[PDB]
Amino acid sequence: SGFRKMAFPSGKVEGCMVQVTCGTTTLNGLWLDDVVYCPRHVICTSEDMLNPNYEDLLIRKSNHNFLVQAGNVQLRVIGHSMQNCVLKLKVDTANPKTPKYKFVRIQPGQTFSVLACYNGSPSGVYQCAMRPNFTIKGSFLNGSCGSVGFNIDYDCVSFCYMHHMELPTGVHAGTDLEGNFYGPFVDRQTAQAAGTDTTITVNVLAWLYAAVINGDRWFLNRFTTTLNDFNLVAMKYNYEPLTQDHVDILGPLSAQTGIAVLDMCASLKELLQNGMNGRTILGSALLEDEFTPFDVVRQCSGVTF
């Protein structure tokens, strides 16, 4: 037992991280087969970054201007193209460590692990959620761009995020591996703000189920509620509406514990209306919304990769 914020093992992703330098700017790249993927602002100088015209900047660069290194070894670039906000650097060597992989665009509320890297080398791994406002609450410094977020299923790495920037409240924004941003954000240094966030209701419920599995049961009351009535209260506290789809996804946890989803909703409704009166749930004094229902099942059933 016990319940922790767990990241995926990072080994399969570690074997794909490279360093990309163009002129004076250096960031991380993702090396899969014979293509290196990296953020397109590697071709900017500091002054370019206020309002860059990337198509123009890139037309002035050739293959040899891109210095790609895997550890010590330099990889020779033999082609390049721009896909939305990412660079695709074709190299003369296929990465022998390339895992079975896919590129996915995740949905708000879904979690992934970030492998934070600098100069092509990994610094740490941590679990993140795509927030409803299309940011993530990460930990990123200068040079971290090109770091990627991922999920693993069996042997397959689903890449879903590549890091590009940091927004005014210390939140972070990026793209899928096709270079399309999550959210209304653009890769230029002008004033940009995240929209107001909301709490991921389905994930809070999953986490309450995780607490019951671990024997933290004080918050369960004797009531039930309708889906419509619960959502009326969730609205007032800045929680996303709960859908039948969400209810269906909580099915396995509900069946395992014998607590109907709407009974759990009744208990959550009380927590929202009454607070926690100084108590904790799974060690936390606030309700946690960065565990999906799958995350809870993976961790409480020991799914391996």
Q: Check residue 195 for interaction with a second copy (CB under 8 A).
A: no
Residue 258 touches a second copy, criterion: CB under 8 A: no
Q: Which option in a second copy, ligand A1EPZ, none does residue 118 bind, with CB closer than 5 to 8 A by kind?
A: a second copy
Q: Of the two residues 68 and 242, which places its CB atom closer to ligand A1EPZ in the complex?
A: 68
299 binds a second copy (CB under 8 A): yes
Stretches 43-51, 109-117, 184-192, 194-202: which one binds a second copy (CB under 8 A)? 109-117
Site map 159..178 versus a second copy, x via CB under 8 A: -------x---xxx------
Of the two residues 78 and 141, which places its CB atom closer to a second copy in the complex?
141
Note whether 145 binds ligand A1EPZ by CB under 6 A: yes
Can you read off the two tokens belonging to residue 125? 């791994």
Report the largest interatomic distance among the alpha carbons of the chain, rounded to a whole angstrom.
69
**Residue 156 annotated among the catalytic residues of the structure:** no
**Alpha helices, H only, 29-144:** 54-59
Residue 96 binds which one of ligand A1EPZ, a second copy, none, with CB within 5 to 8 A depending on kind?
none
Distance CA(30)–CA(64), nearest Å, equals 18
Of 51-59, 71-79, 250-258, 280-288: span binding a second copy (CB under 8 A): 280-288
Task: For 111-125, give one letter per residue: b (16+ CB within 10 A) or e.
Answer: bbbbbbbbebebeeb
Q: Which of 145, 164, 172, 265 is catalytic?
A: 145
Distances (CA, A) of 181 to 108, 141, 197, 238, 283: 13, 19, 17, 24, 35
Q: How far apart are CA 280 and CA 2, in angstroms?
A: 14
Q: Is 141 in the site for ligand A1EPZ (CB under 6 A)?
A: yes
To a second copy, the closest distance from the beta carbon of 251 in angstroms equals: 22
One DSSP character per residue, 209-260 reads: HHHHHTT--TT--S----HHHHHHHHHHTTBPPP-HHHHHHTHHHHHHHT--
In whole angstroms, the minimum distance from the beta carbon of 301 to a second copy comes to 8
Closer to a second copy by Cβ: residue 79 or 170: 170
- Out of 89, 129, 130, 165, name the contact with ligand A1EPZ by CB under 6 A: 165
Phi and psi of 158, rounded to 5°? -95, 105
Site membership for a second copy, residue 5 (CB under 8 A): yes
Q: Would you count residue 191 as binding a second copy (CB under 8 A)?
A: no
Cα–Cα–Cα angle for 168, 171, 175, rounded to 5 degrees: 110
First and final CA of the chain: distance in angstroms?
A: 20
Tell me the torsion sign for CA atoms 285, 289, 290, 296: positive
Interacting residue with a second copy among 82, 104, 233, 300 (CB under 8 A): 300
Site for ligand A1EPZ contains 262 (CB under 6 A)? no
- Evaluate whether 43 touches 58 at the Cβ level (below 8 Å): yes
79 touching a second copy, by CB under 8 A: no
281: amino acid identity, one letter? I
Sign of CA dihedral 88, 92, 97, 101: positive
With CB cut-offs between 5 and 8 Å by kind, which of a second copy, ligand A1EPZ, none does residue 27 bind?
Answer: ligand A1EPZ
41 in active site: yes
Asked if 214 interacts with ligand A1EPZ (CB under 6 A), we say no
Instruction: Name the residues annotated as catalytic.
Output: 41, 145
> Which residues of the chain form contacts with ligand A1EPZ (CB under 6 A)?
27, 41, 44, 49, 140-145, 164-168, 172, 187-190, 192
